[PDB]
């Protein structure tokens, strides 16, 4: 399938190389971790790469299932 990249280019769903069997959604905190919450760096991965402390990652196998929720003014 294809995944969007918030961490590399701007944001576009491009097919990924061999290895990541699906897409994913990571979250954490940018350079200063502001009050705007964390970021939303989805992309590709072999499997839900979630880990231990605050690395909150997720997955996405449907078509363009990596569109985090943010396009909307308060």
């Amino acid at each position: 399938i294809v995944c969007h990249t918030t961490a590399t280019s701007p944001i576009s769903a491009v097919t990924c190389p061999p290895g990541e069997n699906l897409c994913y959604r990571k979250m954490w905190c940018d350079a200063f971790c502001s009050s705007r919450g964390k970021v939303v760096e989805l992309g590709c991965a072999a499997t839900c790469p979630s880990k231990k402390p605050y690395e909150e990652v997720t997955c996405c196998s449907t078509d363009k299932c990596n569109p985090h929720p943010k396009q909307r003014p308060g």
């Binding site: 701007p10 944001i11 940018d30 705007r36 919450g37 939303v40 985090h68 396009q71």
Partner: peptide
């Protein structure tokens, strides 16, 4: 300027 969890269009500041 990010795709943070509160907007998507690259914001300046």
């Amino acid at each position: 300027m990010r795709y943070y969890e509160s907007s998507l269009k690259s914001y300046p500041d």
